[PDB]
Amino acid sequence: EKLAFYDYIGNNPAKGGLFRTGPMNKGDGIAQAWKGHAVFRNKEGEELFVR
Amino acid sequence: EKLAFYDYIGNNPAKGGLFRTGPMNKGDGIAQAWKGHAVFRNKEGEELFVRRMPAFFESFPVILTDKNGVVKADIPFRRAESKYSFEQQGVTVSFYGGELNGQTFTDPPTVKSYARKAIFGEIFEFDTETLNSDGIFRTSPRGWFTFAHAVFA
Amino acid sequence: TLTYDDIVGTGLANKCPTLDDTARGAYPIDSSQTYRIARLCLQPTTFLVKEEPKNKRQEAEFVPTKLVTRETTSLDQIQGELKVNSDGSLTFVEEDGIDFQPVTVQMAGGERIPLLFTVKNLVASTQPNVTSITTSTDFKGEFNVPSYRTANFLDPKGRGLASGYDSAIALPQAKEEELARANVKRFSLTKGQISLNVAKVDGRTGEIAGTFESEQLSDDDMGAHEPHEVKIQGVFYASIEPA
Amino acid sequence: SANLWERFCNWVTSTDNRLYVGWFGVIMIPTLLAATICFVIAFIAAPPVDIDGIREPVSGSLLYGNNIITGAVVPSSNAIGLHFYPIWEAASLDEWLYNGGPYQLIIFHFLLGASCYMGRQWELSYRLGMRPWICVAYSAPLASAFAVFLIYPIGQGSFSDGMPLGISGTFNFMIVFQAEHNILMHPFHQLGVAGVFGGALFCAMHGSLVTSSLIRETTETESANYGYKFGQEEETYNIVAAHGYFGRLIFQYASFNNSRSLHFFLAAWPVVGVWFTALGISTMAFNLNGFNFNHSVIDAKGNVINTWADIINRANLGMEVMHERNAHNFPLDLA
Amino acid sequence: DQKLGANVGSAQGPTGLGKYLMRSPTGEIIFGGETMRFWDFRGPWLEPLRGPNGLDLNKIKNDIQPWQERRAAEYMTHAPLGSLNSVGGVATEINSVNFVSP
Amino acid sequence: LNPMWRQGMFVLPFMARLGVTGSWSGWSITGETGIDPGFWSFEGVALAHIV
Amino acid sequence: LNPMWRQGMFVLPFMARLGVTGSWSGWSITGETGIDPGFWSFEGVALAHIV
Amino acid sequence: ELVNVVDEKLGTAYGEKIDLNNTNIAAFIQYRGLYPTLAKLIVKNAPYESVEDVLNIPGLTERQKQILRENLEHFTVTEVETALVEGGDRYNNGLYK
Amino acid sequence: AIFRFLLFFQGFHNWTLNPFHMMGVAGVLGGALLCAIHGATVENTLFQDGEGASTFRAFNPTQAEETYSMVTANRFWSQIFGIAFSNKRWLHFFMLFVPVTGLWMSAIGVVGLALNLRSYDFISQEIRAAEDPEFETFYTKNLLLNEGIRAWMAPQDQPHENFVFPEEVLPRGNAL
Amino acid sequence: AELTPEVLTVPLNSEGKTITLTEKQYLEGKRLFQYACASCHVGGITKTNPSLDLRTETLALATPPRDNIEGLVDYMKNPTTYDGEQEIAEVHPSLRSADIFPKMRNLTEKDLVAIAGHILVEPKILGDKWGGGKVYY
Ligand code: CLA
Ligand code: CLA
Ligand code: CLA
Ligand SMILES: CC(C)=CCC/C(C)=C/CC/C(C)=C/CC/C(C)=C/CC/C(C)=C/CC/C(C)=C/CC/C(C)=C/CC/C(C)=C/CC/C(C)=C/CC1=CC(=O)C(C)=C(C)C1=O
Ligand SMILES: CCCCCCCCCCCCCCCC(=O)OC[C@H](CO[C@H]1O[C@H](CS(=O)(=O)O)[C@@H](O)[C@H](O)[C@H]1O)OC(=O)CCCCCCCCCCCCCCC
Ligand SMILES: CC1=C(/C=C/C(C)=C/C=C/C(C)=C/C=C/C=C(C)/C=C/C=C(C)/C=C/C2=C(C)CCCC2(C)C)C(C)(C)CCC1
Ligand SMILES: [Cl-]
């Protein structure tokens, strides 16, 4: 889980604002669990990827 | 409705506190409607009456008496030897006029709930969401003016 | 032997009796002669509290805890019959004794975890065919875990189950649906597991000793919040006699 | 060096120190510093304490949901009673804080130092060539601290019954005391308020009288206080004009004209009155309580005719019946 | 209560501490209630019930002597509680028993 | 059910006691509509004092 | 999933970087228990500076 | 849903008559010759599946069973409620004068 | 009849929790301190104006020099307490201010009690106490005492109300 | 509002027969009630056993009936449990145990009748107070 957590833009320091005060948890919230890796597919079965 | 609203202790200036700031609506909430007059009865059909709260008391017990003032039912503290519990007496409540008009409630929790409210006089429906009320009585402008000028004088 | 004064304040009173390294023999069972336990005793050594795995289910383990109370933990004066069973096994059935002690332990965060360490209505059993009680002759069974606080207990605002207030009288005109859980007191009753594994026997005087391990729930505060899972390890001492 | 120890003693006893560290000071200063530091930390961050020994922890610190008015340092557990409970008597600090450990550390250190504080109020007076007995006046408030923190617990058999170190906690101490002892109906207490009321009265009396009979040396638009210089030879107020006024207020012989007889009365009254109130708590620590006129006056048939004494009893029952909810298992409160 | 059929050893009081019997901070078996503060008391009438670990549950169960019962009743009803005008009992007691312990 | 004295109004009643019972926005203390308070509305009174 | 840098901790990391990774209350930055930080815990460090 | 078992118990036979399975021992004093000896036996001897089961208490003398039969109309029986039976509350529920 | 007036104000108004009352006692108690401390300071800083031990006679009713060493009193308290007077005119006005100001604060508080505008509760406290049954302060404790006072006193203290409180409705702790 | 002989008329025995006490007997009983009862029976209760009081109704449902002079007097000589199925003179003051309870040595049959009368007259005067405890104080 820890490793997966690093691959989340909500831990990127380059996100945020000057007057967006407080910890990162006031933003997206306190992380509870990893929902899991999402794999997207279409009718043909082809696997898609989110930009 | 207006006439019924005055018969509610939540409009008594003698209720409230020195640092209970804001309007009266931050207390019991914004009055929406009159639920209606609650008539309490027991298994024998006798009509009971809720002893109202004196302004002096922050909290008051729920006691039901008949016309002659004889205690017929109440909400006990110690259950071990309760003789007048709503359950033992089969206390029921009916409403006439208003929101709950024509309806009747017989399940003890619901009955005791309205009995707990009848203490304050006429029962009303409040909006506690809006102003984020805390359910604690506050005094009217009449109270504050009186307080300020009595001190100033 | 030591008198009262020879124990007072030393902490020795909260200690189950011990057998010497010698006493490692075996106690015989007539199977045609009734037996009982004149004195069972349980002395806690460690209190483990299974931690909540957060929302992220990751499998939880038991964590050590500090004993925030003092030397009041031990169970003593336990008694009952040790009836011999048709399969040649042995089952202890508790009758009476100091079968419970309220314990409170702290955690990493600082959370106090109060529990009712008990073995009330214990029904321990052994292996089938046990003519003689040898070293490590596992005792296993269940017991009852009554509510930590009893019916009459009142919360800081006067509310209680068998007595006390009906609601939050400090908030005369507040919505009650949210306060429901805290106004309505519930009396908890649950089961527990325990295993007494012998380590020292003494056929001569008929007194066994060893170590135990028990599991139970902690205080739920009249059903105000969820209880913690607790594991309890220590040592025990039993006095078996014909009678 | 004339001799290290000889110099040390000369430094201690020296009257040239900004603050007179005396020989009593050598004990006072450390004990008071431990008391205060422990208190401040406790009042802010200490965890809840099982005061009544019934596994029912009471939080009284700021960080644990309290404010100044409600916050307090909770007395040691009732399971401890009068046993000595230092830090080195606990398996851990967690245990020590749960059983009200800090409380003992504070009260013992305070009472010791505050006693030495009285001792120092003699010492400095000796070194300066002035008369003693100033410390004797301070013996009255100290004896109250002793009665409330030490004597009452000794009498009742536990330090948990000592007055808490906080605003509301003190209020609890009083209300309950009233229930179990009927202190309002006790002579020693009544003498206390007499001393305290009278004290405040006389403090205002003298204060007003003197400040009203000041000799004019100031401008119309200048502070009347500047009409006095530190280190004067003569008096700054007309004591003969003061006596002249107050003597006509009541009647001459019911008025002071002797400044020394005045200031003695000014000191004697509150000190003696508080001395009795301190002795009151120390007396009711062994359950020699106030007057019990319950059901005294009864009519010709035997019916009980109530007095104000009975109405007081009803209030007292309400306190008794409700105090320490779950601590009692038996009918009579003998603890 | 024991004569009414109560098992004093395992009786659970309101706080869950032990209605009649509990433990001292060092493990000794003592009397329950607010009386936990007076577990240091020693007295002729009470000692024969005490064991090597404090109050013995066996002696308590069937070695209680009648003279102890009425001794306990005596001392219970003669606690050192009274008023200045000598009215025995709690400050809320009624006039009847003129008494204040020496 | 929601008059001025429930909403912690302190100055408003003293304006109503002496005549001013309407607002420029159309509403009125008595609960009427279509009324024309003229200049001397609660706004008007407030305006005057500031001046 | 909820480490110091998610809770807006600014001083705490600088104390862990040089060794102090435990608290007098029992817990620890690495997430261990039963550990004995000694005196030099976060509380200890905070205490020293105040003195 | 959350309910107060004790307050709910008062809406049954319990709260109307002496419950042989729940009601505290002191309640047997309001009827002649029941309290000391008999009430101890009743409470000590487990719960009962019916009122009449109390007559089956082993050892009962001919007179005791006579007394019981008389007071049966004052007895009832309901499910054993833990809140009312636990902690030995049937011998002492913390109530006095 | 005054003692019940105190107990009433505690039970119904929670008078002790009122900031104005607190200033009140602070004024009376502190005023009773100034009375004591000033009296004792003078008597023990006196000059020798006689040859007897009983220095009462050795006072000059006709002003002239200060009967006690104001300079010595200053240096005393400056070393034992750290702070000390040095202006009798201010010292005496202060003795007027403290207890008079105190009584006046305690008055304002009672004026508020007339409208029942008391300092009874702390809302932040009650809200937590409602949701959390394990939260207890000495403040919560006190309110429970008030409830007992009100319930057990009201019937015979307010006869005109014809109060009838059944035994079962009376709030009580365990055993007691 | 006075202590009439109408009030001092209490049942002598079970068979309805009554007796009328005198103001001398009442006071004497009252004094004797303080001397040997009040210690545990102050205001009609029982400190060492609050389940049983001195209410006339409670004494009536006793076994044997103890709501009359004869009843109470017998009790003060040979006291029993509420069902009477057990003698408790060893742990209760009585004539047959005056060696154990010295207060009971002086007491004569005249004293026993007075005390008995006192117990039956008080509830006639005090009412609910005599039975209940602190609630009725
Ligand atoms: C530490 C304890 C303490 C202290 C110091 C105080 C201090 C005070 N309390 Mg108090 N109080 C306390 C605890 C305390 N309280 C507690 C625990 C309670 C219970 C809740 C109360 C409840 C309480 C109430 C209910 C009241 C006070 C009031 C007061 C104040 C006025 C007292 C006064 O000067 O009367 C002086 C009173 C006068 C009327 C002065 C005039 C009297 C005339 C001039 C005297 C004439 C005498 C005559 C010539 C002689 C004839 C008499 C004859 C018998 C000889 C004072 C600030 C009162 C207050 O605030 O009033 C504003 C008040 O009403 N208190
Ligand atoms: C005395 C005249 C007076 C009166 C009776 C009122 C009445 C009211 N105002 Mg109001 N107000 C006034 C003047 C007045 N106002 C003034 C002059 C202003 C401009 C600052 C305001 C600004 C104002 C606002 C912004 C609001 C109100 C609101 C309210 C209502 C709620 C009441 C409340 O919050 O009380 C609270 C009362 C207190 C907290 C009492 C404070 C007492 C202090 C703490 C005592 C201080 C003692 C002192 C420090 C001791 C030191 C002395 C010592 C050294 C000797 C009520 C109708 C509210 C409203 O509209 O309701 C919906 C609202 O939001 N008022
Ligand atoms: C520079 C050192 C520094 C840094 C990097 C941080 C970093 C942090 N602090 Mg922190 N703090 C510091 C010093 C610092 N602190 C000091 C010295 C104090 C004592 C007052 C505090 C007290 C403190 C508290 C009490 C809290 C934090 C919190 C936080 C975290 C949230 C960030 C935040 O709210 O930013 C907010 C940043 C801003 C709002 C930027 C303000 C920029 C101003 C407006 C510019 C002013 C321009 C000026 C007026 C122009 C005039 C000049 C002109 C005339 C020429 C973050 C980790 C929070 C936390 O713990 O998170 C959980 C929290 O609650 N800090
Ligand atoms: C960690 C944390 C937060 C801790 C919190 C702990 C805690 C609970 C603290 C709470 C404290 C708190 C908030 C208190 C509230 C109470 C309070 C502030 C009341 C409000 C005060 C007020 C406005 C009320 C009005 C009444 C009033 C004016 C009373 C004032 C009382 C007062 C200050 C009296 C002073 C008494 C005093 C000690 C004076 C000493 C003077 C002195 C040294 C004289 C000696 C002396 C005598 C002589 O004769 C001569 C000649 C000389 C030369 C001489 O020197
Ligand atoms: C476990 C053991 C712990 C040991 C602690 C280590 C030793 C103590 C180190 C002290 C360091 C702090 C220095 C403080 C300086 C100072 O106080 O004034 C400096 C003055 C100046 O003199 C002084 O100063 C002179 C030098 S100079 O003038 O300052 O340069 C010097 O010559 C003279 O001797 C001296 O009197 O010192 C004095 O007047 C002596 C009295 C000091 C009083 C100590 C505090 C009293 C506390 C009472 C309890 C209060 C309770 C809590 C209150 C909130
Ligand atoms: C004068 C003098 C001197 C000096 C002295 C001094 C200066 C001392 C000091 C002392 C001090 C300075 C002391 C201190 C102490 C402290 C303490 C004793 C504290 C304690 C605390 C605690 C114990 C805490 C606890 C806690 C709590 C309560 C809560 C939170 C957690 C904790 C754990 C933290 C000299 C020597 C030179 C010489 C002689 C004279
Ligand atoms: Cl309390």
Touch test F–E: 3 Cβ pairs or more under 8 Å: no
Q: What is the CATH classification number for the domain harbouring J16?
A: 1.10.760.10
Q: Does D302 touch chain J (CB under 8 A)?
A: yes
Experimental method: X-ray
Chain B, nearest residue to I165 by Cα: B63
Q: Cβ distance F20 to F37 under 8 Å?
A: yes
Strands D165-166 and E54-55: unpaired
Nearest to D163 by CA among D60, D308, D233: D60
**Residues forming a β-bridge with C209:** C200, C237
D107 C-alpha vs ligand 5 centroid, how far in Å?
A: 23
Q: What is the DSSP letter of B118?
A: H
The answer for J56, left when phi > 0, alpha when psi is -120 to 50, beta otherwise, is alpha
* Reported structure resolution in angstroms: 5.7
**D121 labelled binding-site residue:** yes
- Is the distance from CB of I109 to CB of I20 less than 8 angstroms? yes
| End-to-end alpha carbon distance in chain F | 35
Q: Do chains B and I touch (3 or more CB pairs under 8 A)?
A: yes
For residue B137, what are the contacts with CB-CB under 8 A and spacing of at least 6?
Answer: B9, B10, B15, B16, B17, B20, B24, B27, B28, C172, C173
I92 known member of a binding site: yes
Give dist(CA I32, CA D198) in Å, integer.
8
Residue C67 Cα distances to C102, C232, I106, angstroms: 12, 12, 48
Residue B125 and residue B95 in contact, taking contact as beta carbons nearer than 8 Å: no
Q: How far apart are CA B114 and CA B107, in angstroms?
A: 11
Q: Is the peptide bond before J64 cis (omega within 30 degrees of 0)?
A: yes
Q: Are I28 and I20 in contact (CB under 8 A)?
A: no
How many CB pairs below 8 A link D and I? 324
Q: Please provide the DSSP assignment of D44-110 as one string.
A: HHPPPB-TTSSS--B--SGGGT--TTT-EEPPPPTTTTT----GGGSS-HHHHHHTTHHHHHHHHHH
Structure token digits, residue D274 = 């508080």
Whats the size of chain D, residue-wise?
335
Closest ligand 6 atom to the C-alpha of D46?
29
Judged by a CB distance cut-off of 8 A, whether residue C174 touches chain I is: yes
Q: Which helix or strand (DSSP H or E) is residue D146 part of?
A: helix D139-146
- The torsion angles phi and psi of B38, rounded to 5 degrees, stand at -95, 120
Probe residue for ligand 4, chosen from D37, D64, D68, D135 as the CB with the greatest number of ligand atoms within 8 Å: D68
Rounded to a whole number of angstroms, the CA Rg of chain J reads 14
| Closest-lying ligand 4 atom to the alpha carbon of residue I105 | 25
* Other beta carbons less than 10 A from residue I48's beta carbon: 9
Atom of ligand 5 nearest to the CA of I79: 39
Is the backbone of residue C110 left (phi > 0), alpha (psi -120 to 50) or beta? left
Of H11, H93, H95, the CB nearest to B87: H11
Residues of G in contact with A1 (CB under 8 A): 1
Residues of H whose CB is below 8 A from E19: 87-88, 92
Contact I123, I23 (CB under 8 A): no
Q: How far H43 CA sits from the closest chain E CA (Å)?
A: 8
Cβ-based contacts of B25 with chain F (< 8 Å): 2, 6-8
Q: Alpha-carbon distance I165 to C82, whole Å? A: 54
**What is the span of the domain harbouring residue H19?**
1-86
Minimum CA distance residue for ligand 4 atom 18: I23
Give kind and range of the element (H or E) at residue B125. Answer: strand B123-127
Evaluate whether D56 touches E14 at the Cβ level (below 8 Å): no
Say whether H37 and J81 touch across the interface (CB within 8 A).
yes
DSSP per-residue codes, E21-75: EEE-TTS-EEE-GGGGGGTT---TTTGGGEEBTEE-HHHHHH---HHHHHHHHHH
Q: How far apart are CA F16 and CA F1, in angstroms?
A: 18
Whose structure tokens read 């006029």?
B97
> Coil, strand, or helix at residue D151?
helix
Cβ-based neighbour number of residue G43 at 10 Å: 16
Fold exhibited by the domain E1-79: Arc Repressor Mutant, subunit A (1.10.10)
Which of 2.40.160.30, 1.10.357.10, 2.60.40.1930, 3.40.1350.10 is the CATH number of C21-149+186-243?
2.40.160.30
Q: Cα C61–C66–C69 angle (5° rounding)?
A: 130
CA of J137 to nearest chain D CA: how many angstroms apart? 8
The residue among I75, I56, I57 whose CA lies nearest residue D130 is I75
Question: Cα–Cα distance between C183 and B118 in angstroms, integer?
Answer: 20
How many Å from the N-terminal Cα to the C-terminal Cα in chain H?
35
CA distances to D330, E31, E89, E97, E102 from E78, rounded to whole Å, are 16, 19, 8, 10, 11
Quickly count: other Cβ atoms within 10 Å of residue C70's Cβ.
Answer: 22
Buried/exposed D227-259: b ≥16 CB within 10 Å, e otherwise: bbeeeeeebbbbbeebbeebeeeeeeeebbbbb
Tokens of B85: 């519990």
Residue C200 has φ and ψ, to the nearest 5°, of -135, 125
**Host H or E run for residue I35:** helix I19-43
CB B90 within 8 A of CB B43: yes
Please give the Cα distance from D73 to D164 (Å, whole number).
6
Residues of C in contact with E20 (CB under 8 A): none
Report CB contact under 8 Å: A31, G8.
no
DSSP for C61-108 reads -EEE-EE-S-S---EEEEEEEEEEPTTS-EEEEEEEEE-EEEEEEE-S
CA distance to partner chain E, nearest, from residue J70 (Å):
25
CATH of residue H58's domain is 1.10.150.320
Which residues of chain E neighbour J38 with C-beta distances below 8 Å? 96-97
Flag whether residue C162 sits within 8 Å of chain D, measured between CB atoms: no
Pocket of ligand 3 contains residue A13 by CB under 6 Å: no
Distances (CA, A) of C28 to C37, C80, C87, C196, C210: 14, 19, 16, 18, 18
Beta strands C139-146; C120-125: pairing state: antiparallel
Reduced to 3 states, what is the DSSP secondary structure of residue C233? strand
Alpha-carbon gap: J35 to the closest alpha carbon of chain E (Å): 8
Q: Work out whether strand D288-289 and strand E82-83 pair parallel, antiparallel, or are unpaired.
A: parallel
Distance I165 CA to ligand 5 centre (A): 64
Burial-class residue J124 by CB neighbours within 10 Å (0-12, 13-18, 19+): middle
Contact call for residues A34 and C56 (beta carbons, < 8 A):
yes
Instruction: Specify the number of domains making up chain J.
Output: 1
Distance in angstroms (rounded) separating the CA atoms of residues J88 and H60: 22
Chains C and F touch (3+ CB pairs under 8 A): no
Q: Which of E32, A41, I24 is nearest to D196 (CA)?
A: I24
Token digits for A5? 């957590």
The residue whose CA is least distant from atom 64 of ligand 2 is B22
B113 vs H: CB within 8 A = no
CB atoms within 10 A of CB I19: 14
Burial class (CB in 10 A: 0-12, 13-18, 19+), D39: buried
Identify residue C83 by its one-letter amino acid code. Answer: K
Q: How many domains would you assign to chain H?
A: 1
Q: F1 Cβ partners below 8 Å, 6+ apart?
A: B1, B2, B5, B30, B31, B32, B33, B34, B124
Q: Which residue, among H10, D313, H16, C165, has the nearest Cα to I170 in the 3D structure? A: C165
- Whose CA is closest to H40, among F1, B139, J81, I19? J81
| Torsion sign over Cα I85, I88, I91, I95 | positive
Task: Using alpha carbons only, give the angle A13, A19, A25 rounded to the nearest 5 degrees.
Answer: 55
Residue D43 CB–ligand 4 contact under 6 Å: yes
For ligand 3, say whether the CB of A22 is within 6 Å of any of its atoms.
Answer: yes
* Residue D114, helix vs strand vs coil: helix
- Measured distance CA(C9)–CA(D266) in Å, rounded: 52
The CA distances from residue B27 to C171, D215, I121, in Å, are 9, 59, 14
| CATH number corresponding to D4-181 | 1.20.85.10
Q: What is the largest CA-CA distance in chain F?
A: 35
C-alpha D96 – ligand 2 centre gap (Å)? 46
Q: Is residue H97 part of a domain?
A: no
Residue of H nearest to D331 (CA): H96
E36 contact partners, CB below 8 Å, separation of at least 6? D53, D78, D79, D81, E22, E24, E30
Question: Which atom of ligand 6 lies nearest, measured to the CA of D21?
Answer: 1
Dig out the tokens for I106 from the structure: 């305690």
Q: Which residues line ligand 6 (CB under 6 A)?
A: D 21, 26, 29-30, 33-34, 37-38, 41-42, 45-46, 93, 97, 102
Give the CA angle between residues C13, C17, C22 to the nearest 5°: 150
Determine the topology of domain C150-185 in CATH: photosynthetic oxygen evolving center fold (3.30.2050)
CA distance I30 to I18: 18
**Nearest C-alpha neighbor of D211 from the set D221, D200, D225:** D225
Distance CA E82, CA F1 (A): 58
3-state secondary structure of G7: coil
What is the distance in angstroms between the Cα of D154 and the nearest Cα belonging to chain H?
Answer: 29
- Per the structure block, which two tokens stand in for C28? 């015989």
Characterize the bridge pairing of strands A47-48 and B104-105: unpaired
